Design a protein around this nucleic acid. Structure first.
Ligand SMILES: [Mg+2]
Ligand SMILES: [Mg+2]
Ligand SMILES: [Mg+2]
Ligand SMILES: [Mg+2]
Ligand SMILES: [Mg+2]
Ligand SMILES: [Mg+2]
Ligand SMILES: [Mg+2]
Ligand SMILES: [Mg+2]
Ligand SMILES: [Mg+2]
Ligand SMILES: [Mg+2]
Ligand SMILES: [Mg+2]
Ligand SMILES: [Mg+2]
Lengths: 105, 166, 78, 120, 140, 192, 97, 64, 55, 42
RNA sequence: AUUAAACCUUGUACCUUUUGCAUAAUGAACUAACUAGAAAACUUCUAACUAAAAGAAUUACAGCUAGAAACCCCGAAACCAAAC
RNA sequence: AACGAGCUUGGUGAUAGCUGGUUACCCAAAAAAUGAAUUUAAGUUCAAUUUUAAACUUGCUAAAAAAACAAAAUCAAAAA
């Protein structure tokens, strides 16, 4: 799969650690359903863990959108321009909390 | 079936600005369901690739293959519509950008054999495609010179790095 | 077919280590008679642990909270 | 191919043997350090069992055993697959305070104070 | 046809995407692509462990090259550095040879000096003062 | 025709993926996309860099003259303040700051060398790379997208001009050291 | 494989039609009705399998008992042959003896 | 090491002599690595956590 | 048919039966059904016991 | 009882919330996967 | 792996089958669709009621009732009856 | 247009101890080809092995002396 895939070299976005460390994650979007069994765990994340995450990371803008939904989804955008999307369908608070922190780092 | 080649002639580009190179005209033409093998037609279609309209017609007029006459007719039909419908000023100012053969919809028949045995005959048909672009034929490719080859060798040497280390 | 120099040297090394094993096995701290019963207690309690686990097998408790908690799946924001 | 009984003479040392290995025929050591240094594959099943009984399933990991005849009897069975070294206690047996600070050296010494500092 | 499998397209795509860089019908035909992909996967897993041994072979070759410049065979260089209580590994040693030629030269002299001390110590039987660079720093 | 609605829905996604590859969409300003609040984004920009800004000044820094013309044109069919004044102060201060740092590090280097390096570090290529990856382009207000490089360069130094006023030269000097002086790492003298 | 290129027409299920709304009513007609009627009397289906269940061999024989003499010639021939096929399988073939 | 001199520990140098400082810049996970000991589905994907460190300073003091 | 705190009943049974066995009895509490299950035959002793409590 | 108090807090019981008693049903194994396919236990 | 598609390095196609081995041997030109484990006597698990259980007919010296849990596909030469 | 006995349909999904095939994942354990009967040796049933669950208590190695023939297979207290 190495020959079947691309490769790169170790790098940092803008010499992140030289002068000052800057957090790359800059936006989180979470779409939810008010009443949907799949989005139950994500709902609890908003109730309990979203505010604490928001305070710890003041450079990450967090958008929470309760709407008629079929799958809750997390969209993470970075300064270098990368966009990552995650299915949050039927995940516990523990899983969603763990996933959100990995995206920030 | 699919018949996209015909609709390629209906594209309308927006008016060009005064300070912009003049876009060459493009004409797409085809003949469908030719009683001829696409493989045999390939050699004729291949030969005229990149040649000018008059050069291609001269080469076709003295060829003994059946497809040669068929391709000539398509080229004449394409040449006329270019002047008549695609605002091509000069008949001779055309060259064959693309020319290829495609399979058609064939028929299945029986070819008899000696011992009450048979085989599946195919009555083959083909398509012929051409795109004509206004302007002189693009210049032919020039083989790479010795000095041209040598420079590439030196670039290959200069690209080298120390492998698997800091 | 001769035997390599690697092969003959390495065996002699193993023989020397085994030769020492012979010596260290010749000086028992306790005689056979002195040995009897010095570890009787530990062996006895050890098996009692084995028996306790073997005979403690039984079904597990069942709780109402488990069954009634399935209803939380339809929890919502009112 | 059957189990073999070694003649008793093998385990009777000689005066020079005491000199070479530096062990006194009196005041014999108490505890063995045993490590398996060969594989039980391709060995008879009885040798395989004694290795499991003695705890030497992993190679090059030392196990402590009593220098008593019953233990010795099993060790003689697998004498060729193991290395026996006499445990030494330069600073005495570990106490409750020193239980967490021990280290077993390659020389056979269980030191009870392990500082990871230059001797100075 | 009460129940018919409706996902066969995506099942086929999974195997095919791992075969698109092959040559021949192995890259587009599932029956042939599937077998070729598995052999690649078996090879990819096994090459992971042969990679680590091949780089160590490369490091040794490069070290022998660098040491022979100063007149030392590879076994002498490695052994006598250890006897001085230097625990630089082979990967790091290569980096020194390629990018730090002056520091590597010093190590060669150091390893040569320790080797020179060893000959005198063994050659002269009896009690002779230990070499300056043969002193071992004990730890406790 | 096989039963089911889900397989058709999955393949619709594939058709979308293919269409984008064949006919890539024209890039669009991040503002026009959903999940966007300008006021919150500006505050996050300042907090991202671990710096305190006066929000009013920072908002002015992003504004460009071209943007105002477009809005007036649409209005024809609040004058506000452009980044110009902030741009000049930021560019002037940055020129002094970069020159000062290099002279201390490289006292012997001739004045011609400093001018080249300073121009290199404040050039469109270097500033363009830094400005894009610090989210400056996302927050910029302009009449054209993608933002033209000279406009992107103008706003970046305008941000430094706002930072200079808000937190003073001492903090502004750190910002130049952190993001511009880093861009000459790994670069030999005669390349710049 | 090949897939639909367009979404099929949306399927609408009305959950409060009379059949769905009043489903299950009169299922305790026995315990709540003094046992005048058993609920199995409320089943609608083939004559030979109202209030009854069996394996395929049992179902074949029971259909023959109830309507065997009113069946068509071709159907009775097929039904009879199915009985003999199932008889020989269930009584002579299988893993377990 | 420097241009003109180097210091070697036996096997480690003293704390006072050398101080090296780093920063943790990124915490990520590796790309999916294939482990397949045959079938096409008898396959395990391995992702392992990773950290990237930037090295900021190497400092020495005259305590030789 | 145990109503109330089923866990309290276990504690009493364990104390009641422990002296006879000499060890704590193994039991399972099924809170949904409301029944207590004990390993071994103790029906006779456990019926007289309940009679005295008045159940 | 305390159990009925839990129902008061919990969401409504409905056809979408049903569940059987745990371990009430065994799972039946079809001869499809490699473990139970191939010679199929015979 | 690589700066680099190929050069360098490692690597005796697959399924069945032999035997737990083949450089045996069978089968496969390729694509799409179709194409092969089915039953409740006993055992186990989950509940209802309990010296009784089951909605008549049955079982019972803790049993009885209900639920859940199971046993393939293709292929002869033949044989017989009635037509042609 | 395949006669040691025509062809067609049905019986009929004839039967085949024989040949072939028998479709997702993961975790775990795991024999044999010893013995016995069989128109039975291309099969099957039982023992033996393996396995899953359950009950409760000794098992493996080693085992003196002493015995049964004898200078290690049975048997085999205490121990470890
Ligand atoms: Mg004929
Ligand atoms: Mg043909
Ligand atoms: Mg190695
Ligand atoms: Mg043969
Ligand atoms: Mg089944
Ligand atoms: Mg017959
Ligand atoms: Mg058959
Ligand atoms: Mg047979
Ligand atoms: Mg045998
Ligand atoms: Mg007999
Ligand atoms: Mg007979
Ligand atoms: Mg005993």
């Amino acid at each position: 799969t190495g020959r079947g895939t691309s490769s790169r070299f170790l790098t940092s976005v803008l010499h992140n650690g030289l002068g000052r460390y800057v957090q790359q994650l800059q936006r989180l979007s979470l779409s939810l359903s008010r009443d949907a069994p799949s989005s139950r765990g994500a709902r609890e994340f908003v109730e309990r863990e979203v505010t604490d995450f928001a305070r710890r990371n003041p450079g990450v803008v967090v958008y929470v959108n309760p709407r008629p939904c079929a799958m809750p989804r997390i969209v993470a955008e970075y300064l270098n321009g990368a966009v990552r999307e995650e299915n949050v369908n039927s995940k516990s608070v523990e899983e969603i909390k763990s996933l959100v922190q990995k995206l920030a780092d | 079936i699919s018949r996209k080649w015909e609709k390629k002639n209906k594209i309308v580009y927006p008016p060009q600005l005064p300070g912009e190179p003049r876009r060459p005209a493009e004409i797409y033409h085809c003949r469908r369901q030719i009683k001829y093998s696409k493989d045999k037609m390939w050699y004729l279609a291949k030969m005229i690739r990149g040649m000018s309209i008059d050069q291609a017609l001269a080469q076709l007029e003295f060829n003994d293959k059946k497809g040669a006459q068929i391709i000539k007719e398509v080229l004449l039909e394409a040449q006329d519509m270019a002047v008549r419908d695609h605002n091509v000023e000069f008949r001779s100012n055309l060259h064959i950008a693309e020319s290829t053969s495609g399979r058609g919809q064939c028929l299945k028949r029986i070819r008899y054999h000696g011992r009450g045995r048979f085989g599946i005959m195919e009555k083959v048909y083909c398509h012929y495609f051409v795109k004509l672009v206004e302007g002189p034929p693009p210049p032919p490719e020039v083989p790479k010179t010795a000095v041209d080859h040598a420079k590439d060798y030196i670039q290959q040497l200069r690209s080298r790095t120390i492998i698997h280390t800091l | 077919r001769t035997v390599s120099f690697q092969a003959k040297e390495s065996m002699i090394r193993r023989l020397e280590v085994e030769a020492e094993n012979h010596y260290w096995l010749s000086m028992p701290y306790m005689t056979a008679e002195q040995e009897c019963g010095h570890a009787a207690e530990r062996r006895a309690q050890a098996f009692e642990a084995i028996k306790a686990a073997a005979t403690s097998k039984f079904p597990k408790h069942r709780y109402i909270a488990d069954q009634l908690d399935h209803l939380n799946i339809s929890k919502k924001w009112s | 191919f059957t189990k073999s009984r070694i003649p008793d003479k093998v385990f009777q040392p000689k005066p020079e043997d005491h000199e070479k290995y530096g062990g006194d025929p009196q005041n014999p050591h108490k505890l063995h350090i045993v490590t398996r240094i060969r594989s039980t594959k391709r060995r008879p099943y009885w040798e395989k069992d004694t290795i499991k009984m003695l705890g030497l399933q992993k190679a090059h990991s030392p196990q402590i055993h009593k220098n008593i005849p019953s233990v010795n009897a099993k060790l003689k069975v697998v004498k060729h697959l193991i290395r026996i070294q006499p445990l030494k206690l330069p600073q005495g047996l570990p106490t409750e305070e020193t239980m967490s600070s021990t280290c077993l050296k390659s020389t056979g010494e269980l030191v009870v104070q392990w500082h990871l500092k230059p001797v100075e | 046809l009460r129940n018919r499998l409706t996902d066969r397209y995506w099942r086929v795509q999974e195997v095919l995407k791992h075969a698109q860089h092959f040559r021949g019908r192995k890259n587009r035909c599932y029956r042939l692509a599937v077998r070729a992909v598995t052999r690649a996967f078996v090879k990819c897993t096994k090459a992971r462990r042969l990679k680590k041994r091949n780089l160590r072979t490369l490091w040794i070759n490069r070290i022998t090259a660098a040491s022979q410049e100063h007149g030392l065979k590879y076994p002498a260089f490695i052994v006598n550095l250890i006897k001085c209580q230097v625990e630089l590994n082979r990967k790091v040693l290569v980096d020194l040879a390629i990018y730090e030629p002056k520091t590597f030269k010093s190590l060669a002299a150091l390893a040569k000096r320790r080797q020179q001390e060893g000959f005198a110590a063994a050659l002269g039987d009896g009690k002779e003062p230990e070499g300056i660079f043969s002193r071992v720093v004990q730890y406790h | 025709v096989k039963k089911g609605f889900r397989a058709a829905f999955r393949f619709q996604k594939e058709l979308e993926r293919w269409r984008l590859l064949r006919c890539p969409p024209p890039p669009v300003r991040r503002s026009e996309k959903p999940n966007w609040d300008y006021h919150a984004e500006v505050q996050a920009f300042g907090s991202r860099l671990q710096e305190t800004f006066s929000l009013d000044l920072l908002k002015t820094a992003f504004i460009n003259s071209c943007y105002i013309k477009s809005e007036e044109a649409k209005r024809q069919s609040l004058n506000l303040k452009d980044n110009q004044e902030l741009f000049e102060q930021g560019l002037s201060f940055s020129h002094r700051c970069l020159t000062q740092f290099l002279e201390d590090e490289f006292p012997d280097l001739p004045a011609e060398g400093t001018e080249s390096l300073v121009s290199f570090l404040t050039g469109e290529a270097v500033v363009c790379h830094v400005a894009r990856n610090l989210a400056v382009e996302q927050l910029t207000l302009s009449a054209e997208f993608p933002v033209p490089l000279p406009v992107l360069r103008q706003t970046f130094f305008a941000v430094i001009g706002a930072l200079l006023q808000s937190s003073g030269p001492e903090r502004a000097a750190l910002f130049i050291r952190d993001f511009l002086i880093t861009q000459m790492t790994g670069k030999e003298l005669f390349e710049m | 494989a090949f897939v639909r290129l367009t979404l099929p027409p949306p399927k609408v299920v009305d959950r409060w039609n009379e059949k769905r709304a009043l489903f299950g009513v009169y299922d305790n007609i026995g315990i709540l009705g003094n046992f005048e009627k058993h609920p199995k009397e409320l089943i609608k289906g083939p004559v030979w399998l109202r209030g009854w269940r069996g394996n395929e061999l049992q179902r074949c024989v029971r259909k023959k008992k109830f309507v065997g003499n009113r069946m068509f010639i071709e159907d009775l021939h097929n039904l009879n042959k199915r009985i003999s096929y199932l008889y020989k399988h269930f009584n002579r073939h299988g893993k377990y003896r | 090491g420097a241009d003109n001199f180097t210091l070697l520990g036996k096997p480690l140098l003293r704390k006072e002599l050398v101080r090296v400082e780093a920063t943790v810049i990124e915490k990520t996970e590796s790309w999916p690595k294939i482990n397949m000991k045959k079938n096409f589905r008898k396959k395990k994907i391995i992702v392992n956590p990773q950290t990237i460190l930037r090295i900021n300073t190497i400092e020495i003091a005259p305590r030789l | 048919k145990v109503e109330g705190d089923i866990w309290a009943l276990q504690k009493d049974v364990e104390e009641f039966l422990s002296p006879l066995l000499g060890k704590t009895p193994i039991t399972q509490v099924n809170e949904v059904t409301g029944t207590l299950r004990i390993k071994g035959y103790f029906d006779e002793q456990l019926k007289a016991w309940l009679l005295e409590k008045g159940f | 009882g305390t159990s009925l108090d839990l129902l008061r807090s919990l969401p409504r019981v409905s056809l979408a919330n049903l569940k059987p008693s745990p371990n009430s049903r065994k799972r039946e194994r079809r001869p499809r996967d490699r473990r139970r396919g191939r010679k199929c236990g015979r």
